Amino acid sequence: MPPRASIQQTADYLGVSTKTVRNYIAAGKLKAVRLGPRLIRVERDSVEALMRPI
């Protein structure tokens, strides 16, 4: 367990499944971060439906 630990390491450390860790994170029992920017893409369809004619 280094300061920032993989989901796997946290699972092994705690003796639970990686799923359980992911649920803990998702429920606010564990704090987690992601490293770096996401590669984000917007769906054209929603852009199209955002523009309401007048």
Residue 7: strand, helix, or coil: helix
Shortest spacing between CB 27 and a copy of itself, in angstroms: 8
Structure-token pair, residue 33:
């971060």
Contact call for residue 16 and a copy of itself (CB under 8 A): yes
| Coil vs helix vs strand at 45 | helix
Smallest gap from residue 28 Cβ to a copy of itself (A):
9
Structure tokens, 15: 């003796």
Residues that bind a copy of itself (CB under 8 A): 1-7, 9-10, 12-16, 20-21, 24-25, 27, 29-47, 50-54
